[PDB]
Design a binder for this molecule. Sequence first.
Ligand SMILES: [Cu+2]
Ligand SMILES: [Cu+2]
Lengths: 158, 150
Amino acid sequence: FKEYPAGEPVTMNEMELAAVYLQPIDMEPRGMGLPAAKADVHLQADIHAVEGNKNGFGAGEWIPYLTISYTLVNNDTGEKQEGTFMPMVASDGPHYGANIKMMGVGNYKVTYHIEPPSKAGMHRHTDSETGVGRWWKPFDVSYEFKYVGLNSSGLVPR
Amino acid sequence: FKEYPAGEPVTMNEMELAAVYLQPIDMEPRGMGLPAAKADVHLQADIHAVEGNKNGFGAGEWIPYLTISYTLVNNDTGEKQEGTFMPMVASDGPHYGANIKMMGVGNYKVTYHIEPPSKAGMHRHTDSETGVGRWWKPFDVSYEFKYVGL
Ligand SMILES: [Cu+2]
Ligand SMILES: [Cu+2]
């Protein structure tokens, strides 16, 4: 399937963090979250270790057990939306995301608010023999993108 | 670091599942965990996708968001201990595990009771465009090993 970048990926805390979006999706269980028919996009956080990660993840590996919320702003209109992502798995692997209703075509800012795996119940080893570095503190990452909508076969008859 | 196999790996539900143990470890956040000084081993489940996984995981990838409990039996005496594993990360990557006090040197069987990532809140996509196969049903896998101490 096709996916579209929302702004520029960034590196922070030995991870590469990107925002992306695609068409609304269906997830298990049915009836939970915003239904696809009532959404404009599935918004996602793509987060993987980079080389030199000190928390036990190899380059390219997904970072699991994160807690992530977002603040989305249409910069043209001022309209703001807040929400949370869930951990998910799709055909191209695990991610964090949510179906969302957008706030019209325009220039957007999105900020992801990220908390480390300790919060959701992952426990790092801390000893000399098997341990890893301490978790980083919660942080934000921001993205700027132009949203025009997604591809159609035709919105009106031809 | 040093690590000991508990039996051999198993391939089930498009995953390779192995049991290993090592010396007790320290972990954070501690919560309800058993301190290294009060344990005999750290027991672990190593669980990664194999080729052909239908749930969105590529070969060799860790399977995250599992809910795993164990039943450990000393086969010489019949004594049984039960407990839960936690998701963890060590210098060689993520696993599931727990510090455990054994029930003496001897022959042991450990059974891992495994529930799929839906239980712990990972949501699979289900649509034709982006979806993946249904989760397997919760299942057991067991391993035999000789605990002689460390
Ligand atoms: Cu998703
Ligand atoms: Cu562990």
